[PDB]
């Protein structure tokens, strides 16, 4: 009947999932560059720059 | 004139920039955000001249 009786395991799973999710989401940052996509920026500027 | 520069729109066209690039009629040629020779694969819309 009673729920949330196994909080520790759920918290561990949630922490792991959240860490992986933010690691995946980090890929969409410009970091000061022109764009955050490799293929498009490769096809726009010469390799010297 | 300097203060009344003409503005035109380019859209729904096919443009061969190779003949413009290899042409020596233009004294100076600076492309800023795109490589001069990389204009034949990627393309845009609503070109402002």
Curated annotation (Swiss-Prot), chain A:
Outcome following mutation: residue 11 to N: In strain: Delta/B.1.617.2, Mu/B.1.621
Q: Which domain of life is it from?
A: Viruses
Region feature Heptad repeat 1, mapped onto this chain: 1-31
In UniProt terms, what is the effect of altering residue 30 to K?
Answer: In strain: Omicron/BA.1, Omicron/BA.2, Omicron/BA.2.12.1, Omicron/BA.2.75, Omicron/BA.4, Omicron/BA.5, Omicron/BQ.1.1, Omicron/XBB.1.5, Omicron/EG.5.1
Coiled-coil stretches: 10-49
Function of the protein:
Subunit of the fusion protein that is processed upon entry into the host cell. Mediates fusion of the virion and cellular membranes by functioning as a class I viral fusion protein. Contains a viral fusion peptide that is unmasked after S2 cleavage. This cleavage can occur at the cell membrane by host TMPRSS2 or during endocytosis by host CSTL. In either case, this triggers an extensive and irreversible conformational change that leads to fusion of the viral envelope with the cellular cytoplasmic membrane, releasing viral genomic RNA into the host cell cytoplasm.
Protein name (record):
Spike protein S2'
Q: Which residues of the full protein are shown?
A: 940 to 988 of 1273
């Amino acid at each position: 009947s009673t729920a949330s009786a196994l909080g520790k395991l759920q918290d561990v799973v949630n922490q792991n999932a959240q860490a992986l999710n933010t690691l995946v989401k980090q890929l969409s940052s410009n970091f000061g560059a022109i764009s955050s996509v490799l293929n498009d920026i490769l096809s726009r500027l010469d390799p010297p720059e | 004139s300097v203060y009344a520069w003409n503005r035109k729109r380019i859209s729904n066209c096919v443009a061969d920039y190779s003949v413009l690039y290899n042409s020596a009629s233009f004294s100076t040629f600076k492309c800023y955000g795109v490589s001069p020779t990389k204009l034949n694969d990627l393309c845009f819309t609503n070109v402002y001249a």
